[PDB]
């Protein structure tokens, strides 16, 4: 009984798993536990939770807690997360990241754009066109449209 009371004294860390009739989905639960287990907002220790949220599709969780306004998100902080979201096709997440004070003009770089284009999926049509043709994107557009 004393052990149970001691556990309750620090219930901020414990989190139950809702089966929800074979839910088999708890990434949101992990994120919720991680956020509720931090408390202090310094904007330098919350990057890992943000990266995890990007790796998953828990945009709602990140918005509710990570971008609830309590934390002071900087500009350079979100560069890597935005790049990851772009590479993995996270539309809602990229919209959220850009929404919260991210300067695209200072972000996009020739190297960044080259990587984005190199993210073409395996032997995709765009990949074939790029190989046939630095991003080297003007030539492909001129070939397609006609350059006239």
């Amino acid at each position: 009984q004393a052990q149970v009371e001691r556990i309750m004294t620090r219930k901020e860390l414990l989190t139950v798993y809702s089966s929800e009739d074979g839910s088999e989905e708890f990434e949101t639960i992990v994120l919720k536990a991680l956020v509720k287990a931090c408390g202090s907002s310094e904007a330098s220790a919350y990057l890992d939770e943000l990266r995890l949220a990007v790796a998953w599709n828990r945009v709602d969780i990140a918005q509710s807690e990570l971008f609830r306004g309590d934390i002071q998100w900087r500009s350079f902080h979100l560069e890597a997360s935005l790049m990851d979201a772009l590479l993995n096709d996270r539309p809602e997440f990229v919209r959220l990241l850009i929404s919260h004070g991210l300067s695209l003009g200072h972000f996009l770089t020739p190297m960044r754009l080259a990587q984005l284009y190199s993210a073409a999926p395996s032997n995709s049509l765009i990949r074939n066109l790029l190989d046939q043709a630095p991003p080297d994107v003007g030539h492909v557009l001129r070939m397609l449209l006609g350059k006239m």
């Binding site: 907002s41 971008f67 609830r68 306004g69 309590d70 002071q72």
Partner: protein, 76 residues
């Protein structure tokens, strides 16, 4: 709104977006003047703190949502 008293009162309100302790004092003066004020959540210090207080530890929030200086000051 013109025509002397034949017109009608012109509405007014103040929009708050972040701030500091001086901004909080400004808000207090305005409220004591009986002028509506609107706060935006997530703006930053002096604005999100009041929003949280309205939504609702208080001392911890005062220190958290605002920089360390003046946080210990119970005048806040």
């Amino acid at each position: 709104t013109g025509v002397g008293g034949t017109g009608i009162d012109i509405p007014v309100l103040l929009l708050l977006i972040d701030g500091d302790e001086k901004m909080l004092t400004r808000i207090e003066n305005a409220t004591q003047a009986q002028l509506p004020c609107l706060l935006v959540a997530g703006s930053g210090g002096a604005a999100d703190c009041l929003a949280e207080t309205l939504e609702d530890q208080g001392e911890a929030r005062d220190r958290i949502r605002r920089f360390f200086p003046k946080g210990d000051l119970e005048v806040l």
